[PDB]
Coordinates of C-alpha atoms and ligand atoms in Angstrom, one line a residue:
Chain V
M1 CA -5.3 -22.0 8.3
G2 CA -6.6 -25.5 8.5
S3 CA -3.9 -28.1 8.0
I4 CA -0.1 -27.9 8.3
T5 CA 2.2 -30.5 6.7
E6 CA 5.9 -31.0 7.2
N7 CA 7.9 -30.8 3.9
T8 CA 11.4 -32.0 4.7
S9 CA 12.6 -31.2 1.2
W10 CA 12.5 -27.5 2.3
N11 CA 15.6 -28.4 4.5
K12 CA 17.8 -28.3 1.4
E13 CA 18.0 -24.4 1.5
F14 CA 18.8 -24.4 5.2
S15 CA 21.5 -27.2 5.1
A16 CA 23.2 -25.4 2.2
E17 CA 23.9 -22.4 4.5
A18 CA 24.2 -24.5 7.8
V19 CA 21.2 -22.6 9.2
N20 CA 18.9 -23.7 12.0
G21 CA 15.5 -22.2 11.3
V22 CA 11.9 -22.7 10.2
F23 CA 9.8 -21.4 7.3
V24 CA 6.0 -21.6 7.4
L25 CA 3.9 -20.9 4.3
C26 CA 0.1 -21.0 4.1
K27 CA -2.1 -20.7 1.0
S28 CA -5.4 -19.1 1.8
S29 CA -7.6 -20.7 -0.9
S30 CA -6.6 -24.3 0.0
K31 CA -6.6 -23.6 3.8
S32 CA -3.3 -25.4 4.0
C33 CA 0.2 -24.7 5.3
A34 CA 3.6 -26.3 4.8
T35 CA 6.8 -26.1 6.9
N36 CA 10.3 -27.6 6.9
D37 CA 10.1 -28.4 10.6
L38 CA 6.8 -28.8 12.4
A39 CA 8.3 -28.8 15.8
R40 CA 10.2 -25.5 15.3
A41 CA 7.1 -24.0 13.6
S42 CA 5.4 -24.0 17.1
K43 CA 8.5 -23.0 19.1
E44 CA 8.3 -19.4 20.5
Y45 CA 11.0 -16.7 20.1
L46 CA 11.6 -13.0 20.9
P47 CA 9.6 -11.0 18.3
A48 CA 12.2 -8.2 18.1
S49 CA 11.1 -5.7 15.4
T50 CA 8.2 -7.8 14.2
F51 CA 6.6 -6.4 17.3
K52 CA 6.2 -3.1 15.4
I53 CA 3.1 -4.6 13.7
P54 CA 1.0 -5.1 17.0
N55 CA 2.7 -2.0 18.7
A56 CA 1.7 0.3 15.8
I57 CA -1.9 -1.0 15.9
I58 CA -2.1 -0.6 19.7
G59 CA -0.6 2.9 19.5
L60 CA -3.4 3.9 17.1
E61 CA -6.1 2.2 19.2
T62 CA -5.1 3.9 22.4
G63 CA -4.5 7.3 20.7
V64 CA -0.8 7.4 21.6
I65 CA -0.4 7.6 17.8
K66 CA -2.8 10.5 17.2
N67 CA -3.5 9.6 13.6
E68 CA -2.3 8.1 10.3
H69 CA -0.3 11.2 9.4
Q70 CA 1.5 11.9 12.7
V71 CA 5.2 12.8 12.3
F72 CA 7.8 11.5 14.8
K73 CA 10.2 14.3 15.2
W74 CA 13.9 13.6 15.6
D75 CA 14.9 15.6 18.6
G76 CA 18.6 15.9 17.7
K77 CA 20.1 13.2 19.9
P78 CA 22.5 10.6 18.3
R79 CA 20.6 7.3 17.6
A80 CA 22.0 3.7 17.5
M81 CA 21.3 3.6 13.7
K82 CA 22.1 6.4 11.3
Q83 CA 18.8 5.9 9.3
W84 CA 16.8 6.8 12.4
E85 CA 18.3 10.3 12.7
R86 CA 15.5 12.3 11.0
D87 CA 11.8 13.1 11.0
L88 CA 9.7 9.9 10.2
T89 CA 6.2 9.1 9.2
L90 CA 4.4 6.1 10.8
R91 CA 5.3 4.1 7.6
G92 CA 8.9 5.4 7.7
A93 CA 9.4 4.4 11.3
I94 CA 8.1 0.9 10.6
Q95 CA 10.1 0.5 7.4
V96 CA 13.5 1.8 8.7
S97 CA 12.7 0.0 11.9
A98 CA 13.3 3.0 14.2
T99 CA 13.2 1.1 17.6
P100 CA 13.4 4.2 19.8
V101 CA 10.2 5.7 18.3
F102 CA 8.4 2.4 19.3
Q103 CA 9.9 2.2 22.7
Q104 CA 8.4 5.6 23.5
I105 CA 5.0 4.5 22.1
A106 CA 5.1 1.4 24.4
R107 CA 6.0 3.6 27.4
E108 CA 2.9 5.8 26.6
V109 CA 0.6 2.8 26.0
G110 CA 1.4 1.5 29.5
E111 CA 1.4 -1.9 31.1
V112 CA -2.4 -2.3 31.6
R113 CA -3.4 -1.4 28.0
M114 CA -0.5 -3.3 26.4
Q115 CA -1.4 -6.5 28.4
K116 CA -5.1 -6.2 27.4
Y117 CA -4.3 -5.8 23.7
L118 CA -1.9 -8.7 23.6
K119 CA -4.6 -10.8 25.1
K120 CA -7.1 -9.6 22.5
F121 CA -4.6 -10.4 19.8
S122 CA -3.6 -13.8 21.2
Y123 CA 0.0 -12.6 20.7
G124 CA 2.5 -15.4 21.7
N125 CA 3.0 -16.2 25.4
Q126 CA 1.7 -12.6 26.2
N127 CA 4.4 -12.1 28.7
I128 CA 5.3 -8.4 28.9
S129 CA 7.7 -8.6 31.9
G130 CA 11.2 -7.2 31.4
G131 CA 10.2 -3.5 31.3
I132 CA 7.5 -1.8 29.2
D133 CA 9.9 -0.5 26.6
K134 CA 11.8 -3.7 25.8
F135 CA 9.9 -6.9 26.8
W136 CA 9.9 -7.8 23.0
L137 CA 13.6 -6.9 22.6
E138 CA 15.3 -8.5 25.6
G139 CA 12.4 -9.5 27.9
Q140 CA 10.1 -12.4 28.3
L141 CA 7.7 -12.1 25.3
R142 CA 7.9 -15.1 22.8
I143 CA 5.9 -15.9 19.7
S144 CA 6.0 -18.8 17.2
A145 CA 6.1 -18.8 13.4
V146 CA 2.6 -20.4 13.4
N147 CA 1.3 -17.7 15.7
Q148 CA 2.8 -15.0 13.5
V149 CA 0.9 -16.4 10.4
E150 CA -2.3 -16.5 12.5
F151 CA -1.9 -12.9 13.6
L152 CA -1.0 -11.8 10.0
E153 CA -4.1 -13.6 8.6
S154 CA -6.3 -11.8 11.1
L155 CA -4.7 -8.5 10.2
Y156 CA -5.2 -9.2 6.4
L157 CA -8.9 -9.9 7.0
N158 CA -9.4 -6.9 9.4
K159 CA -10.5 -9.4 12.1
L160 CA -8.1 -8.3 14.9
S161 CA -9.8 -6.8 17.9
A162 CA -9.1 -3.2 16.7
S163 CA -10.8 -0.8 14.4
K164 CA -10.8 -1.7 10.7
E165 CA -9.3 1.7 10.0
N166 CA -6.3 1.2 12.3
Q167 CA -5.7 -2.2 10.7
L168 CA -5.8 -0.7 7.2
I169 CA -3.4 2.2 8.2
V170 CA -0.9 -0.4 9.5
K171 CA -1.3 -2.6 6.4
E172 CA -0.3 0.2 4.0
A173 CA 2.7 1.0 6.2
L174 CA 3.8 -2.7 5.7
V175 CA 3.9 -2.6 1.9
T176 CA 7.4 -3.5 0.6
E177 CA 6.7 -4.3 -3.0
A178 CA 4.0 -3.1 -5.4
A179 CA 3.3 -4.4 -8.9
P180 CA 0.0 -4.5 -11.0
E181 CA -0.7 -8.2 -10.0
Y182 CA 1.8 -8.8 -7.2
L183 CA 1.8 -7.1 -3.7
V184 CA 4.0 -7.9 -0.7
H185 CA 3.5 -6.9 2.9
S186 CA 6.5 -7.8 5.1
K187 CA 8.6 -7.0 8.3
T188 CA 12.0 -8.1 9.4
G189 CA 13.3 -8.8 12.9
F190 CA 16.8 -9.2 14.5
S191 CA 17.4 -9.6 18.2
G192 CA 21.2 -9.6 18.0
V193 CA 24.0 -12.2 18.0
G194 CA 23.5 -13.6 21.5
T195 CA 26.0 -15.4 23.7
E196 CA 27.7 -18.7 24.6
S197 CA 24.9 -21.3 24.2
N198 CA 22.2 -18.7 23.4
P199 CA 22.2 -17.5 19.8
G200 CA 19.9 -14.7 18.7
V201 CA 16.9 -14.9 16.3
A202 CA 16.2 -13.4 12.9
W203 CA 12.7 -13.0 11.5
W204 CA 10.9 -12.3 8.2
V205 CA 7.1 -12.4 8.3
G206 CA 4.4 -11.2 5.9
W207 CA 2.1 -12.1 3.0
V208 CA 2.1 -12.1 -0.8
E209 CA -1.0 -11.3 -2.8
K210 CA -0.7 -12.8 -6.3
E211 CA -3.6 -12.6 -8.7
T212 CA -6.6 -13.7 -6.5
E213 CA -4.4 -15.9 -4.2
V214 CA -2.8 -14.9 -0.9
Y215 CA 0.1 -16.6 0.9
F216 CA 1.0 -15.9 4.5
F217 CA 4.6 -16.6 5.6
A218 CA 6.9 -16.6 8.7
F219 CA 10.6 -17.4 8.8
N220 CA 12.9 -17.5 11.7
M221 CA 16.5 -18.7 12.3
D222 CA 19.1 -18.9 15.0
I223 CA 21.8 -16.4 14.4
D224 CA 25.1 -15.7 16.2
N225 CA 26.9 -14.0 13.3
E226 CA 25.6 -10.8 11.9
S227 CA 27.0 -11.5 8.4
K228 CA 24.4 -14.3 8.1
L229 CA 21.5 -11.9 8.4
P230 CA 20.6 -11.5 4.7
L231 CA 19.6 -15.2 4.8
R232 CA 16.4 -14.2 6.6
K233 CA 15.2 -13.0 3.2
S234 CA 17.1 -15.2 0.7
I235 CA 16.0 -18.6 2.1
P236 CA 12.2 -17.7 2.2
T237 CA 12.6 -16.1 -1.3
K238 CA 14.2 -19.2 -2.7
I239 CA 11.5 -21.4 -1.2
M240 CA 8.7 -19.1 -2.4
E241 CA 10.3 -19.0 -5.8
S242 CA 10.4 -22.8 -6.0
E243 CA 6.7 -22.8 -5.2
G244 CA 6.0 -20.5 -8.2
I245 CA 5.1 -17.5 -6.0
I246 CA 8.5 -15.8 -6.8
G247 CA 9.2 -14.2 -3.4
Chain D
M1 CA -4.5 23.5 -2.7
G2 CA -3.5 27.1 -1.8
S3 CA -2.0 29.2 -4.5
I4 CA -1.0 28.3 -8.1
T5 CA 1.9 29.9 -10.1
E6 CA 2.6 29.4 -13.8
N7 CA 6.2 28.3 -14.5
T8 CA 6.9 28.4 -18.2
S9 CA 10.3 26.7 -17.8
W10 CA 8.5 23.3 -17.6
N11 CA 7.4 23.7 -21.2
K12 CA 10.8 22.4 -22.1
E13 CA 9.8 18.7 -21.7
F14 CA 6.6 19.3 -23.7
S15 CA 8.1 21.2 -26.6
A16 CA 10.8 18.6 -27.0
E17 CA 8.0 16.1 -27.8
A18 CA 5.6 18.5 -29.6
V19 CA 3.1 17.8 -26.8
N20 CA 0.1 20.1 -25.9
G21 CA -0.5 19.4 -22.3
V22 CA -0.4 20.5 -18.6
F23 CA 1.3 19.4 -15.4
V24 CA 0.1 20.5 -12.0
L25 CA 2.4 19.9 -9.0
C26 CA 1.5 20.8 -5.4
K27 CA 3.7 20.7 -2.3
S28 CA 1.6 20.0 0.7
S29 CA 3.7 21.7 3.4
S30 CA 4.1 25.0 1.5
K31 CA 0.4 25.0 0.4
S32 CA 1.4 26.0 -3.2
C33 CA 1.1 24.5 -6.7
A34 CA 3.0 25.1 -9.9
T35 CA 2.0 24.5 -13.5
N36 CA 3.4 25.0 -17.0
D37 CA 0.0 26.3 -18.2
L38 CA -2.5 28.0 -15.9
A39 CA -5.2 28.2 -18.6
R40 CA -5.0 24.4 -19.3
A41 CA -4.7 23.6 -15.6
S42 CA -8.4 24.6 -15.1
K43 CA -9.7 23.1 -18.5
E44 CA -12.0 20.1 -18.0
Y45 CA -11.4 16.8 -19.9
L46 CA -13.0 13.3 -19.9
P47 CA -11.6 11.4 -16.9
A48 CA -11.3 8.1 -18.7
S49 CA -9.9 5.4 -16.3
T50 CA -8.8 8.0 -13.7
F51 CA -12.5 7.6 -12.9
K52 CA -11.7 4.2 -11.3
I53 CA -10.6 6.2 -8.2
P54 CA -14.0 7.7 -7.3
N55 CA -15.9 4.7 -8.8
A56 CA -14.1 2.3 -6.5
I57 CA -14.8 4.5 -3.4
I58 CA -18.5 4.7 -4.5
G59 CA -18.8 1.0 -5.1
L60 CA -17.5 0.3 -1.6
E61 CA -19.7 3.0 -0.1
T62 CA -22.9 1.6 -1.6
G63 CA -22.0 -2.0 -0.8
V64 CA -21.9 -2.9 -4.5
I65 CA -18.3 -3.9 -3.8
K66 CA -19.0 -6.1 -0.7
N67 CA -15.6 -5.4 0.9
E68 CA -11.9 -5.1 0.5
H69 CA -11.4 -8.6 -0.7
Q70 CA -14.3 -8.9 -3.2
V71 CA -13.3 -11.0 -6.3
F72 CA -14.5 -9.9 -9.7
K73 CA -15.1 -13.1 -11.6
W74 CA -14.5 -13.3 -15.3
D75 CA -17.5 -14.8 -17.2
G76 CA -15.2 -16.5 -19.7
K77 CA -16.4 -14.4 -22.7
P78 CA -14.1 -12.1 -24.8
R79 CA -12.8 -8.9 -23.2
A80 CA -11.1 -6.1 -25.1
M81 CA -7.7 -6.7 -23.4
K82 CA -6.2 -10.2 -22.6
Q83 CA -5.0 -8.9 -19.2
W84 CA -8.7 -8.5 -18.3
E85 CA -9.7 -12.1 -19.1
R86 CA -9.2 -13.5 -15.6
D87 CA -10.6 -13.2 -12.1
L88 CA -9.4 -9.9 -10.4
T89 CA -9.2 -8.4 -7.0
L90 CA -10.1 -4.7 -6.6
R91 CA -6.5 -3.7 -6.6
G92 CA -5.9 -6.0 -9.7
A93 CA -8.8 -4.5 -11.5
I94 CA -7.6 -0.9 -10.8
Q95 CA -4.0 -1.8 -11.7
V96 CA -4.7 -3.5 -15.0
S97 CA -7.5 -0.9 -15.6
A98 CA -10.2 -3.5 -16.2
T99 CA -12.9 -1.1 -17.5
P100 CA -15.7 -3.8 -18.0
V101 CA -15.4 -4.6 -14.2
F102 CA -16.0 -0.9 -13.4
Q103 CA -18.7 -0.5 -15.9
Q104 CA -20.7 -3.3 -14.1
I105 CA -19.9 -1.5 -10.8
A106 CA -21.4 1.8 -12.2
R107 CA -24.5 -0.1 -13.4
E108 CA -25.0 -1.5 -9.9
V109 CA -24.3 1.8 -8.2
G110 CA -27.1 3.3 -10.4
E111 CA -27.7 6.9 -11.5
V112 CA -29.1 8.4 -8.2
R113 CA -26.2 7.2 -5.9
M114 CA -23.6 8.0 -8.6
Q115 CA -24.9 11.6 -9.0
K116 CA -25.0 12.2 -5.3
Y117 CA -21.5 11.0 -4.7
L118 CA -19.9 13.0 -7.5
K119 CA -21.6 16.1 -6.1
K120 CA -20.3 15.2 -2.5
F121 CA -16.8 14.7 -4.0
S122 CA -17.1 18.0 -6.1
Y123 CA -15.9 15.8 -9.0
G124 CA -15.5 17.9 -12.1
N125 CA -18.6 19.2 -13.8
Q126 CA -20.6 16.3 -12.1
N127 CA -22.4 15.6 -15.3
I128 CA -23.3 11.9 -15.6
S129 CA -25.3 12.0 -18.8
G130 CA -24.5 9.7 -21.7
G131 CA -25.3 6.4 -20.0
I132 CA -24.7 5.1 -16.5
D133 CA -21.9 2.8 -17.7
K134 CA -20.1 5.2 -20.1
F135 CA -20.5 8.8 -18.9
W136 CA -16.8 9.1 -17.9
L137 CA -15.6 7.3 -21.1
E138 CA -17.6 8.9 -23.9
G139 CA -20.3 11.0 -22.2
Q140 CA -20.4 14.5 -20.7
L141 CA -18.3 14.2 -17.5
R142 CA -15.3 16.5 -17.5
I143 CA -12.7 17.3 -14.8
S144 CA -9.6 19.5 -14.7
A145 CA -6.0 18.9 -13.5
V146 CA -6.6 21.3 -10.6
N147 CA -9.8 19.4 -9.6
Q148 CA -7.9 16.1 -9.7
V149 CA -5.2 17.3 -7.3
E150 CA -7.9 18.7 -5.0
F151 CA -9.8 15.4 -5.1
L152 CA -6.5 13.4 -4.5
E153 CA -5.5 15.7 -1.5
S154 CA -8.9 15.0 0.1
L155 CA -8.4 11.2 -0.5
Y156 CA -4.9 11.3 1.0
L157 CA -6.3 13.2 4.1
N158 CA -9.4 10.8 4.4
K159 CA -11.6 13.9 4.1
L160 CA -13.8 12.8 1.2
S161 CA -17.5 12.3 2.0
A162 CA -17.1 8.6 2.5
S163 CA -15.9 6.3 5.3
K164 CA -12.2 6.5 6.3
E165 CA -12.0 2.7 5.9
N166 CA -13.2 2.9 2.2
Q167 CA -10.8 5.7 1.4
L168 CA -8.0 3.6 3.0
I169 CA -8.9 0.5 0.9
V170 CA -8.8 2.5 -2.3
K171 CA -5.5 4.0 -1.3
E172 CA -3.7 0.7 -0.9
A173 CA -5.2 -0.4 -4.3
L174 CA -3.5 2.7 -5.8
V175 CA 0.1 2.0 -4.6
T176 CA 2.5 1.7 -7.6
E177 CA 5.9 2.1 -6.0
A178 CA 6.9 1.3 -2.4
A179 CA 10.3 1.9 -0.7
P180 CA 11.2 2.5 2.9
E181 CA 10.9 6.4 2.7
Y182 CA 9.3 6.8 -0.7
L183 CA 5.8 5.8 -1.7
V184 CA 3.8 6.5 -4.9
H185 CA 0.1 6.2 -5.5
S186 CA -0.9 6.7 -9.1
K187 CA -3.5 6.0 -11.9
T188 CA -3.3 6.5 -15.7
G189 CA -6.1 7.3 -18.2
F190 CA -6.5 7.4 -22.0
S191 CA -9.8 8.4 -23.7
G192 CA -8.7 7.1 -27.1
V193 CA -7.3 8.9 -30.2
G194 CA -10.3 11.3 -30.6
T195 CA -11.8 12.3 -34.0
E196 CA -10.8 14.7 -36.8
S197 CA -9.8 18.1 -35.2
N198 CA -10.7 16.8 -31.7
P199 CA -7.9 14.8 -30.0
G200 CA -8.4 12.4 -27.1
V201 CA -6.8 13.0 -23.7
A202 CA -4.2 11.0 -21.7
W203 CA -3.8 11.3 -18.0
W204 CA -1.5 10.4 -15.1
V205 CA -2.5 11.5 -11.6
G206 CA -1.5 10.6 -8.1
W207 CA 0.8 11.6 -5.2
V208 CA 4.3 11.0 -3.9
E209 CA 5.1 10.6 -0.2
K210 CA 8.8 11.4 0.3
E211 CA 10.1 11.3 3.8
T212 CA 7.7 13.6 5.6
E213 CA 6.7 15.6 2.5
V214 CA 3.8 14.9 0.1
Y215 CA 3.5 16.0 -3.5
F216 CA 0.2 15.8 -5.4
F217 CA 0.2 15.7 -9.2
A218 CA -2.0 15.7 -12.3
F219 CA -0.9 15.5 -15.9
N220 CA -2.9 15.6 -19.1
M221 CA -2.1 15.9 -22.8
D222 CA -3.9 15.9 -26.2
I223 CA -3.3 12.6 -28.0
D224 CA -4.3 11.4 -31.5
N225 CA -1.8 8.6 -31.9
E226 CA -1.4 5.6 -29.5
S227 CA 2.4 5.7 -30.0
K228 CA 2.6 8.9 -27.9
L229 CA 1.0 7.2 -24.9
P230 CA 4.2 6.7 -22.8
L231 CA 4.7 10.5 -22.6
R232 CA 1.9 10.6 -20.0
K233 CA 4.4 9.1 -17.6
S234 CA 7.8 10.2 -18.9
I235 CA 7.0 14.0 -19.1
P236 CA 5.7 14.2 -15.4
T237 CA 8.6 11.9 -14.2
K238 CA 11.2 14.1 -15.9
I239 CA 9.7 17.2 -14.3
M240 CA 9.5 15.6 -10.8
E241 CA 13.1 14.3 -11.2
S242 CA 14.2 17.9 -12.0
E243 CA 12.4 19.0 -8.9
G244 CA 14.4 16.5 -6.8
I245 CA 11.3 14.4 -6.1
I246 CA 13.2 11.1 -6.2
Ligands
LIG1 CL1 10.5 -2.1 18.0
LIG2 CL1 -14.3 -5.1 -22.7
LIG3 CL1 -13.3 2.6 -16.0
LIG4 CL1 -17.8 3.6 -23.8
LIG5 CL1 2.3 4.8 -19.9

């Protein structure tokens, strides 16, 4: 958007849970954003599963994902999560966050084309070192909350450097709540619990369409205890509720 | 859609409510459809607000709807329903069924382009007589339950004679339930209570994407009393539940 202002009153929801994190919320019509922590809003972290958004688009663009209705066949091998042990649509693989499906997509896209698309998308530090199938999971790729909102705004407007149809296909795959005058697109992320001095990161990013308004959001937090994960949704929902958006 | 088979065991949900109607359900992977009433499955009825689906695609195709994020401004004058007395997005206008918005779209599309597109879409009897802004509401346009599922299948597959991008836009506008492995696109219709010896029609049409399967559906029923309106959703829902479609 245009402006960003720091709203320190938004710390109340973080301090109540002893969480270190940031929430960025932008209202389209007023071209204005608010955040609890300006400094952290610009700090870059591992995207983890939020990378499914650009990866899905790049997969379609390059033709690795053949079309909108491609089925990703479970081959029979045990997977890290139980919910991934089945055939999945593109929307399904995004929604249940089936990481191995996307690791294979990334391998097929390749280094040259992945690099070019992350440049076109202005996606974070654009550092894809750490292996083609994990740079966004444990490698060197980093993105800020502000950069996520910018990327999501471009996607909403079909202004990414990709076909309008591929942007649309990925947008329907991101729908997480549908009501007559309320629509939510969103995606979670979780890198793990980390180590001594290096906590992991949790994400919730997306946008809310309410009546004729649109609000873009990005949340992240430091995490070293997996039982704290639901906070990645509860904190932003509480803040958006207080704003009259209602999460 | 493939083959169609009459299954009279579905009549249970209709007889319970003294409803004269039809449900058509098609399973994409098996290329087969079932219905409680083969005769009625092919009978053609006023589309009523189910017409918002092709009308929206046509509005986008012709540039009358400038793009995905066009806002339909309320002029501040009375509208039939309070829910319509506000600015609406395309999705909002479809979801609250803001008929006056779509009537102005039809006027701006105009007769020639509207006729051409309904032919291209093989949309019912393709009869647009009765006024450019009311042919699907009180005029001569008629479409069957079988034709609705055929049209919806084409939309799902992006195979209508329109840009893939415009078909995609109208598809997101139609989403009515979203879950990680369960997605519903749907649209209701209701022509009114009819006249003596001539009931109105109520519709519910759409599709269900469940894991990797897809089910297309079209329901219609005779209606002469507004109190019966919720049956247009409850009957099909009960049948789809009995079929294990979540
Ligand atoms: Cl991933
Ligand atoms: Cl009106
Ligand atoms: Cl209408
Ligand atoms: Cl009329
Ligand atoms: Cl209803």
